Paper text:
Here, we investigate the molecular origins of the nearly billionfold rate enhancement achieved by directed evolution of the computationally designed Kemp eliminase [name] (7). The Kemp elimination is a well-studied model for proton transfer from carbon that has served as a benchmark for de novo design. Although the first-generation [name] design is significantly more efficient than an “off-the-shelf” catalyst like bovine serum albumin, its specific activity was further increased 200-fold over 17 rounds of mutagenesis and screening. All [name] variants have an inactive conformational sub-state, rooted in the original protein scaffold, which was gradually supplanted with a catalytically competent sub-state as evolution progressed.
To disentangle the catalytic contributions of M84C and [name] from those of more distant mutations, we introduced them singly and together into the original computational design. [name] increased [name] activity only 1.5-fold, in marked contrast to the 40-fold loss in efficiency seen when Gln50 was reverted to Lys in [name].17 (22). The maximum likelihood X-ray structure of [name] [name] shows that the Gln50 side chain is properly oriented to hydrogen-bond with the TSA, but it shows significant disorder in the ensemble refinement, as do Asp127 and adjacent residues. Similarly, M84C provides no catalytic benefit to [name] on its own. Together, however, these two mutations boost catalytic efficiency substantially, increasing the rate of the chemical step ~30-fold and overall catalytic efficiency 10-fold.
Numbering used by the authors: -1 to 303
The structure:
Amino acid sequence: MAEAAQSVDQLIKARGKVYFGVATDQNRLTTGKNAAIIQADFGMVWPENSMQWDATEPSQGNFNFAGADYLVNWAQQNGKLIGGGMLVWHSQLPSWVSSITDKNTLTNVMKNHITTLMTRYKGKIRAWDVVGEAFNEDGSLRQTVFLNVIGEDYIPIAFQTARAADPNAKLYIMDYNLDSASYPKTQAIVNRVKQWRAAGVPIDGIGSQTHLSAGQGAGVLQALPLLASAGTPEVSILMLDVAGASPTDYVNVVNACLNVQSCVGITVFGVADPDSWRASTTPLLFDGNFNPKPAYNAIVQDLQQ
């Protein structure tokens, strides 16, 4: 009953991009047709939760890598690239980290978390989301424990530490609602990343978590070039999904990446609609029967060359 298809990963590489990827983890790989679809159609996998802080360091200095190892091992078995993260994020943070008020203590904790995770997989990981969701909607920095205890230097320090732990990895800052050039948040992240790179922070990429509502794909055609103007080596579309999964929206986002030389690829936030955090809007590229949806076939048509 499986349908004939083409790999969007193979097609996007033929157009000069690095990958078309997907978020997943052990329980998805064990169920449905996820592993088979990822094997056939996607070239990079990202851990949805198994590399988050609550999963990997549930108490200080006590690391748990079972779920992360599963994904890394599966990807290597199956010839897939691997992305990791998020290393520094206020969500899915254990309470013991929020307990800390001493600046030097939290710095050491953050640096240890980054170094331990990145060293375990040194040379194996294409890219790490070093800092995620650091900005408020108005463009100011989000008042997380890291900002409140360490200050603004937590971002410089996090990236310097990551570069040392694995110099081969691409180091990303990531955020959401960067989907319109008109947003104060989009302009602010660009301004701050330019200034951070002038301060020597090794921010290799900006990753735009592109959770779109219907019709918002068109806006990414202007938002992504604006993000590229920060001058980072790379940008990327991360955690893509689209309410309604209209082919027009999905093709607009793909074309945004094709239009930007620093865009290295696109990652979709899961395989099949029923597993989406917004499943009721059927926002992914495969349906509940694990068959490719019209948007998948529209991407395929757009990437033919």
